[PDB]
Design a protein around this ligand. Structure first.
Ligand SMILES: NC1=NC(=O)C(C2CCNC(=O)C3=NC(Br)=C[C@H]32)=N1
Length: 274
């Protein structure tokens, strides 16, 4: 630990604060996160989870009741990049490359029985080479929370990550959060108001979910062409499948990678102001 120089606070992760540091010895620039014995094994399983689209966990330093996670340093996160392009908009070719990379990253996690659980623009990091990576794997914002989680599902699947990514995809396209809920019920009702209140017809077993209530107002599904205009039909087709109420009907990361939408995917480079 005495081997690091805090450079500046580059944010506050969900489980602790994150700083930019200079390895006092090797001089390398990294990201330090100031954070049970089960979670110590837990996060050591992460050290082996390496992929081009997953922020590298360089090291773990457990010391005097303080847990420190050393990560590879990426200057910008997606939330900050979306604000900076909020007037012009991220070019579609770039939106497509990012989604593709993230789906590749998710596909890798999910094939290893690892879920993210808390995907959001803030935990997605980008670099000048046009790459995007997943950061902050869960072990206050509900905008990207899948409906089965909101309805009390304790043993939810990897599909929750597809839901969250579908929400981020739609946000990159419209430059407005899809379902900006301010409460558990506001979030759920915002989803219901747009995709229609779920029932036994579209989601078998929903009415048996822990927090489901027959008293939920019954809204109808809205025109989907009104949800993410002016996204093309290939993209709208893919988003609709990522936003399916039924977690087992929801498109998988691997399968998503085979959708015609990525037929012309490329790897353009952003224009960051670091
Ligand atoms: N919420 C977050 N949980 C995290 O672990 C991070 C990191 C760590 C990965 N490496 C970096 O360089 C980072 N840059 C920025 Br910005 C944030 C982060 N954020």
């Amino acid at each position: 630990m005495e081997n690091f120089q805090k450079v500046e606070k580059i944010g506050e992760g969900t489980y602790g604060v994150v700083y930019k540091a200079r390895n006092k010895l090797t001089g390398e620039v990294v990201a330090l996160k100031k954070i049970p014995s089960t979670a110590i094994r837990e996060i050591s399983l992460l050290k082996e989870l390496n992929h081009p689209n997953i922020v590298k966990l360089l090291d773990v330093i457990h010391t005097e009741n303080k847990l420190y996670l050393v990560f590879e340093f990426l200057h910008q996160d997606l939330k900050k990049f979306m604000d900076a392009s909020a007037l012009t908009g991220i070019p579609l070719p770039l939106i497509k490359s990012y989604l593709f990379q993230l789906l590749q990253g998710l596909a890798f996690c999910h094939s290893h029985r690892v879920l993210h659980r808390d995907l959001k623009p803030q935990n997605l990091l980008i670099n000048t080479e046009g790459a995007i990576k997943l950061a902050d794997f869960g072990l206050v914002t509900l905008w990207y929370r899948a409906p089965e989680i909101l309805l009390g599902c304790k043993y939810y699947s990897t599909a929750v990550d597809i839901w969250s990514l579908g929400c981020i995809f739609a946000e990159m396209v419209t430059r407005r959060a899809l379902f900006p809920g301010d409460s558990e019920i506001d979030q759920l009702f915002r989803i219901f108001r747009t995709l229609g209140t779920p029932d036994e017809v579209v989601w078998p077993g929903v009415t048996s979910m822990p927090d489901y209530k027959p008293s939920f107002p019954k809204w109808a599904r809205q025109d989907f062409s009104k949800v993410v205009p002016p996204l093309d039909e290939d993209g709208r087709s893919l988003l609709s499948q990522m936003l399916h109420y039924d977690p087992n009907k929801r498109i998988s990361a691997k399968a998503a990678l085979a959708h015609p939408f990525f037929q012309d995917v490329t790897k353009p480079v952003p224009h960051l102001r670091l």
